[PDB]
Amino acid sequence: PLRIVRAESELSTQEKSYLSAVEKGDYASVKLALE
Amino acid sequence: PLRIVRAESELSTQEKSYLSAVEKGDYASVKLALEEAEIYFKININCIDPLGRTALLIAIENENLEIIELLLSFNVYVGDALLHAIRKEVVGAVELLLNHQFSDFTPDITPIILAAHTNNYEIIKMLVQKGVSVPQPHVDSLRHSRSRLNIYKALASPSLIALSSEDPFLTAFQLSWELQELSKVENEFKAEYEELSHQCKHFAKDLLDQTRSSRELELILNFRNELARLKLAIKYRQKEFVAQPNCQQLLASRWYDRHWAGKLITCVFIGLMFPLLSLCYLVAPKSRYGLFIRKPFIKFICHTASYLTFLFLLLLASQHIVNPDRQGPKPTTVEWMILPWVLGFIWTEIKQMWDGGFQDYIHDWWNLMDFVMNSLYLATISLKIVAYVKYSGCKPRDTWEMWHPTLVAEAVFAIANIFSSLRLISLFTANSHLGPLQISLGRMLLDILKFLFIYCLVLLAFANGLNQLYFYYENSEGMTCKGIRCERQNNAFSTLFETLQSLFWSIFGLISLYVTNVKADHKFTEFVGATMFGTYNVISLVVLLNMLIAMMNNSYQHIADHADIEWKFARTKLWMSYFEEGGTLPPPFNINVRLNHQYQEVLRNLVKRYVAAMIRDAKTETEENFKELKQDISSFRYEVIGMM
Ligand SMILES: Cn1c(=O)n(CCCO)c(=O)c2c1nc(Oc1ccc(/N=N\c3ccccc3)c(OC(F)(F)F)c1)n2Cc1ccc(Cl)cc1
Numbered sequence A: 001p002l003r004i005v006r007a008e009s010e011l012s013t014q015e016k017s018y019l020s021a022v023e024k025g026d027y028a029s030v031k032l033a034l035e
Numbered sequence B: 001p002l003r004i005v006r007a008e009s010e011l012s013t014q015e016k017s018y019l020s021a022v023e024k025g026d027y028a029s030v031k032l033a034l035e036e037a038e039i040y041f042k043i044n045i046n047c048i049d050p051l052g053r054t055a056l057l058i059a060i061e062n063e064n065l066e067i068i069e070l071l072l073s074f075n076v077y078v079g080d081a082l083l084h085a086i087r088k089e090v091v092g093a094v095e096l097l098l099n100h101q102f103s104d105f106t107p108d109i110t111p112i113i114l115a116a117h118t119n120n121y122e123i124i125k126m127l128v129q130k131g132v133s134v135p136q137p138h139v140d141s142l143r144h145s146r147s148r149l150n151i152y153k154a155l156a157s158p159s160l161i162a163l164s165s166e167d168p169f170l171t172a173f174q175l176s177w178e179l180q181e182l183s184k185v186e187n188e189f190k191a192e193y194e195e196l197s198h199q200c201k202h203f204a205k206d207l208l209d210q211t212r213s214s215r216e217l218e219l220i221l222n223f224r225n226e227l228a229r230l231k232l233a234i235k236y237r238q239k240e241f242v243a244q245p246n247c248q249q250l251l252a253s254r255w256y257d258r259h260w261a262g263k264l265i266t267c268v269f270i271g272l273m274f275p276l277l278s279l280c281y282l283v284a285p286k287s288r289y290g291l292f293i294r295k296p297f298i299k300f301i302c303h304t305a306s307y308l309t310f311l312f313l314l315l316l317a318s319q320h321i322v323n324p325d326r327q328g329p330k331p332t333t334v335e336w337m338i339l340p341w342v343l344g345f346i347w348t349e350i351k352q353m354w355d356g357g358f359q360d361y362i363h364d365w366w367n368l369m370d371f372v373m374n375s376l377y378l379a380t381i382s383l384k385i386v387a388y389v390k391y392s393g394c395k396p397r398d399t400w401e402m403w404h405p406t407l408v409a410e411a412v413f414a415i416a417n418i419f420s421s422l423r424l425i426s427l428f429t430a431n432s433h434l435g436p437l438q439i440s441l442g443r444m445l446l447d448i449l450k451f452l453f454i455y456c457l458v459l460l461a462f463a464n465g466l467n468q469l470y471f472y473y474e475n476s477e478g479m480t481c482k483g484i485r486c487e488r489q490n491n492a493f494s495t496l497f498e499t500l501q502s503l504f505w506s507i508f509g510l511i512s513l514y515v516t517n518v519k520a521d522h523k524f525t526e527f528v529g530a531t532m533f534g535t536y537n538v539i540s541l542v543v544l545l546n547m548l549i550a551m552m553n554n555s556y557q558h559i560a561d562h563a564d565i566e567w568k569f570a571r572t573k574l575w576m577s578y579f580e581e582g583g584t585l586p587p588p589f590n591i592n593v594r595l596n597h598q599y600q601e602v603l604r605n606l607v608k609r610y611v612a613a614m615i616r617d618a619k620t621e622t623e624e625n626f627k628e629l630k631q632d633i634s635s636f637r638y639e640v641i642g643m644m
Helices: A013-022 A027-034 B016-025 B026-034 B055-061 B065-073 B081-088 B091-098 B112-116 B121-130 B139-157 B158-163 B167-180 B191-208 B214-221 B228-235 B244-257 B261-272 B274-283 B296-314 B333-353 B365-389 B407-430 B434-441 B446-473 B494-507 B523-543 B546-555 B564-578 B595-620 B623-643
Strands: none
Touching: A013 B016, A027 B623, B016 B026, B016 B055, B026 B065, B055 B065, B055 B081, B065 B407, B081 B091, B081 B112, B081 B261, B112 B121, B112 B139, B121 B158, B121 B595, B158 B167, B158 B191, B158 B407, B158 B494, B158 B595, B167 B191, B167 B228, B214 B228, B214 B244, B214 B564, B214 B595, B244 B296, B244 B564, B244 B595, B261 B274, B261 B296, B261 B407, B261 B546, B274 B296, B296 B333, B296 B407, B333 B365, B407 B434, B434 B564, B446 B523, B446 B546, B446 B623, B523 B546, B595 B623
């Protein structure tokens, strides 16, 4: 059989860095992204 | 003794600092070590340590991704680090290792199989997003058996079922069954095949446990007449899927559709008036009194009362009032009101035949206990009808031959009342107190059957010995009776039949001690016979009946661990037989376009909630306290870097 991804989509290519910023924690980048 | 190292070489001196640098985390030092222009520093970057880990293995062990990227940008050896990263479940390193002779992983282990073994939702999702295929399970018997087990161990992971399927319920049922029949045709990894099937039974229960409202639970259990999916789960022996509080409540609501003393009298009152409401089902199946019998609870009471009516007059067929002794008698009054019940039971069995075919129809105990009694009743009818037309005359009963057909018919009729009255215990799976007791009592009974094969050999051996010793002294001179079943027991060990009977009645102490004597002054043979009888008594009563207690006492504890999920399963099986028409008459009076879309939407909601719950539970569990330290350390480091 061929395993596939069912009923799912992709998040983003630029929001991954924004999420990782709050994942690791850095006030500068997190603030800058929102501002 | 003198000890020296066997088959080991020394690596180097310069590389020790390089290994320590990549271990500790000196990012600049490892960059400098790899920084070689037009000449190598004689330092082998792809060197191994006494511990056996490569430079890339040390880095992925310490989670330091920066040195991992530094090493990868210099083209160090790669090809085994991806599997180690997946095994360590470091998600950051997996992506890096993906967008780029001694091994510790079996040559059949693909990265997808190892990821499914680890059971990580993120790693499996990342791997499948690029497109991977799991091989289909169908010389070197060691590798082929292991390869099959690794594919099944990775095909049963809950994450893969929830991530790639069309109906996570059906795949859980089918895979759990084919993993159960594969544990017996492969009886060398049976322990690791039963457990793999066990975890596929709880997945369906957990997926069903995520229901929020009553409407969606009904749609799940009515997918593909009524309760179509529930009947499918009973087929695959899904005990955990059925013994769940929500579906138990749903079934109880249909079943019932008061106090301890306020229920027994109500049941008696309802059962006393069963014929009226049963005739109402034939005269006019309407709401006033014909729809009452349609309630499963009401139907169960009436059938129980009707069967007790048959049992009551069965006790009235042995009252002296109802007939003298005479050859070939016409049946008495009771027999003509007994015949309808026997005919109804035979009719019910024949009706049950059409959906069976000896496939799971004869394995159940209370089907082979009904076939025997029906056969006995038919044989009684045949023998009585044979004796009626070819015999007559009020000859005294003390003159008939021992093989007279009337005697045999009476005997087989008597052997048939013991089996009809022993099926009332099958109705104990409806009481909350007597229910679990019967189920647990019938499970510590295959252990007793295994213990008979030793007693039947000891008995045969001692019977052979005693008969061989005593067969020379048979006598029947001046005695009215002969055997052990009279007042003056004699000829106890003269033949093999009487010897096998004498050693059975000695368990209960019903055989005396003067049966080991002979009509001669041979004290040597009498002493040997007595010693053999005593040796048989010792073996079977203090050595063999104390190991049956000892091994039943240590087998009841396992049965009581899971005894509510089996009693509820049996009770649901009993309940579902009364839900539909085709039997709503006591034995006495016996003669898609959008449903798929809605189901898929509910399935999506259930799968998403289950994924959220599993990731929440796995992430949190002491383990949550580890993340905060790293988070605050990283925040402090970033703050310091920003200030500098
Ligand atoms: C097997 N037998 C026997 O058939 N007859 C009947 C023959 C006469 O009709 C005995 O009379 C007898 C006996 N055995 C005995 O002595 C024992 C008893 C029990 C032992 N052990 N355990 C148990 C365990 C549970 C319950 C009962 C006994 C045991 O253990 C041993 F020493 F290791 F042998 C030895 N006697 C009595 C006797 C007669 C003559 C002498 Cl000189 C000495 C003793």
